[PDB]
Write a protein that binds this ligand. Sequence first.
Ligand SMILES: *[C@@H]1O[C@H](CO)[C@@H](O)[C@H](O)[C@H]1NC(C)=O
Ligand SMILES: *[C@@H]1O[C@H](CO)[C@@H](O)[C@H](O)[C@H]1NC(C)=O
Lengths: 49, 49
Amino acid sequence: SECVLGQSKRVDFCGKGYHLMSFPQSAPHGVVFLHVTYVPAQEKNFTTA
Amino acid sequence: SECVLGQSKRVDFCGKGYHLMSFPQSAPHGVVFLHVTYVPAQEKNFTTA
Ligand SMILES: *[C@@H]1O[C@H](CO)[C@@H](O)[C@H](O)[C@H]1NC(C)=O
Ligand SMILES: *[C@@H]1O[C@H](CO)[C@@H](O)[C@H](O)[C@H]1NC(C)=O
């Protein structure tokens, strides 16, 4: 109800990282979610104020 | 997962009041959370439109 039909703001609920979309495939006696996320990769530091 | 590793917008979940931070101390056969909050204290009333 939450991850598929909308965007989830709860941290580490519908996937490790920031949440974008989900896809609900079926399976024998169960369901399999495919979560799509967004993870920063390359970082660089600066001086702030 | 939710209160510590991020901020929570859920009401009355990670502490009474608006939520800021939490620290997860340990304890035998359990765990103890310390929640920081934010409570408005004084009041003053006016007329609006
Ligand atoms: C940025 O972080 C690196 C650590 O990998 C550090 O050596 C460097 O001094 C930092 N940048 C500045 C401007 O200090
Ligand atoms: C503000 O609230 C008090 C109740 O404590 C009331 O007596 C007062 O008339 C109110 N002031 C205004 C401007 O509504």
